[PDB]
Design a protein around this ligand. Structure first.
Ligand SMILES: [Zn+2]
Ligand SMILES: [Zn+2]
Length: 571
């Protein structure tokens, strides 16, 4: 590759004091040119969740393997592998579907550049430490310089000096940020997308899909989705440039060509001498850390599922996939007549998908899915997918969903996951060197999230009150509970939680017809005991009963360690 030398010659330039090329490199498809050369437990939450001191899943999450072994062997194992090129017929159909999809996605919207001001706003609020750069003119000078490089068809630093990484990310956000900021994959615009809907809506969306007449609901994982993105996928995602103004088109074509279709990655290797870092390149796959990775994964997944549905419906044959002169017409006619309707049968979030086809031939439509490189996880290539007849069974975005019948007769659809995962996560604190205060506040953060998202789990509501009772009323929850793009962080507030519960689940809930306020937590429903239990609850156990009865004691213990602040009783 010619158009790659600049970044190869730059890291060579600074790191010449240790530079060489190793003959013992574990890179068999990642082309190689050279190489050079801590997270505690939340004490508050733990104290109030004693019965979970034992639980294996809880213990497992309280273990972090990040530095010495856990990313040198993990982020390297099944990544340096190839994907066979899709057949020519497959390639044609994909190309038509991508053309049609971009056109559809852009029917009401025009692509535009995002701005320094927009990027500043987002960095300040924490979204999707780096502040120093953002209030620094020099940073924007470096940004401007690399932009002039991109404009000329060249790339310098898109791989303190932390300014280059962020710089790269901004330019990316500048050329492709519109996909998120202008909501291209919101349900209203994308039909299959759920971007910006929020976790508290995902269940309602699944239930609406369940009402569409058809076969079962399918939700196959892809084994390492990002590793499965082909050169062909990348070229189809690029078709979005056609809709851009000349000035935007340049900057975008730069991003795709230089950082998507021709990447330069830095990664460490355990060379038995010292801590070394390798520099490698590849024409395909996806790098997670990129702004707009989500947009393009949602896009390619949407396309992929449309192709599977097409095969399911008999539009695509093995013969069609092999045909280097496959005719466009039947795909075009399928897309133009049935395209949108088939998108309405789907919920897609990056590599997460749920699909409800018109019948169950879909279960066996595997030719194209396999040939496209999107091989399902933990299943023989050619075994039909398991479908679910109950939408409540369907996994999506680490959750499943339940319908609840409130005492007043109304219904809620609520997010849920095995309780140990919830408690295990709350019991962890990201990073060492925290005071009790910052620790108490992260707990409250989790506690209030549980009262808005998982209030229907008996144990988590009790733990929730316990935490809120032990932490001063006026202390503001800080630091996030999750990085999920589906989280709207309504729990990050000193506003009383039943007021917020009412805003989220009654007032602003478009699926709630009757707007009558809930005046007490006693009218906020639980999962049935039975379901609560199958989802991990400890209700019924005596250790849980003891903890419940003896919770006031531990609350007081936490209280006297915090000091003579203002407390409220939530039990
Ligand atoms: Zn660059
Ligand atoms: Zn559940």
């Amino acid at each position: 590759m010619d158009v790659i030398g600049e970044r190869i010659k730059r890291i060579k330039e600074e790191h010449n004091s240790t530079w060489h090329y190793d003959d013992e490199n574990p890179y068999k498809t990642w082309a190689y040119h050279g190489s050079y050369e801590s997270s505690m437990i939340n004490g508050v939450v733990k104290l109030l969740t004693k019965p979970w001191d034992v639980v294996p899943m809880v213990t497992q999450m309280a273990m972090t393997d990040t530095t010495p072994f856990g990313q040198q062997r993990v982020f390297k194992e099944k990544v340096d592998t190839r994907t066979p090129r899709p057949l020519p017929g497959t390639r044609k159909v994909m190309e038509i579907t991508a053309e049609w999809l971009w056109r559809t996605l852009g029917r009401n919207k025009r692509p535009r550049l995002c701005t320094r001001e927009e990027f500043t706003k987002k960095v300040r609020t924490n979204a999707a430490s780096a502040k120093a750069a953002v209030e620094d003119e020099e940073f924007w000078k470096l940004v401007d310089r690399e932009r002039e490089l991109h404009k000329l068809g060249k790339c310098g630093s898109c791989v303190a000096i932390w300014y280059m990484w962020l710089g790269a990310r901004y330019l990316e956000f500048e050329a492709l940020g519109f996909l998120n900021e202008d909501h291209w994959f919101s349900r209203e615009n994308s039909y299959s997308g759920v971007e910006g809907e929020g976790l508290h809506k995902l269940g309602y969306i699944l239930r609406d899909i369940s009402k569409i007449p058809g076969g079962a609901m399918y939700a196959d994982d892809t084994a390492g989705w990002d590793t499965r993105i082909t050169e062909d996928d990348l070229h189809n995602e690029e078709k979005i440039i056609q809709q851009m103004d000349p000035e935007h088109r340049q900057l975008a074509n730069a991003i795709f060509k230089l950082t998507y279709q021709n990447k330069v990655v830095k990664v460490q290797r355990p060379t038995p001498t010292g801590t070394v870092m390798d520099i490698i390149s590849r024409k395909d796959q996806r790098g997670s850390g990129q702004v707009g990775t989500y947009g393009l994964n949602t896009f390619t997944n949407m396309e992929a599922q449309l192709v599977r549905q097409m095969e399911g419906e008999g539009v695509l044959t093995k013969a069609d996939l092999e045909n280097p002169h496959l005719l466009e017409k039947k795909i075009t006619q399928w897309l133009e007549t049935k395209g949108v309707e088939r998108l309405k049968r789907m919920a897609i979030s990056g590599d997460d998908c749920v699909v409800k086809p018109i019948d169950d031939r879909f279960a066996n439509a595997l030719l194209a899915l396999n040939d496209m490189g999107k091989v399902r996880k933990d299943i023989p290539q050619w075994q039909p997918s398991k479908g679910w007849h109950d939408w409540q069974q369907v996994p999506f975005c680490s959750h499943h969903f339940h319908e609840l019948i409130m005492k007043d007769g109304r219904k809620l659809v609520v997010p849920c996951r095995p309780q140990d995962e919830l408690i295990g996560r709350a019991r962890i604190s990201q990073g060492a060197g925290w005071s009790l205060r910052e620790t108490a506040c992260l707990g409250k953060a989790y506690a209030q999230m549980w009262s808005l998202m998982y209030f229907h789990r008996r144990d988590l509501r009790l733990a929730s009150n316990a935490i809120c009772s032990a932490v001063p009323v006026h202390w503001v929850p800080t630091s996030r509970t999750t990085w999920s793009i589906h989280a709207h962080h309504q729990w990050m507030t000193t506003e009383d939680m039943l007021t917020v519960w009412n805003r989220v689940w009654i007032e602003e809930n478009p699926w709630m017809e009757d707007k009558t306020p809930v005046t007490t937590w006693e009218n906020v429903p639980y999962l049935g005991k039975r379901e609560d239990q199958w989802c991990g609850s400890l209700i019924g156990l005596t250790s849980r009963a003891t903890w419940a009865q003896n919770i006031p004691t531990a609350i007081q213990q936490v209280r006297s360690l915090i000091g003579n602040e203002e407390f409220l009783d939530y039990m």
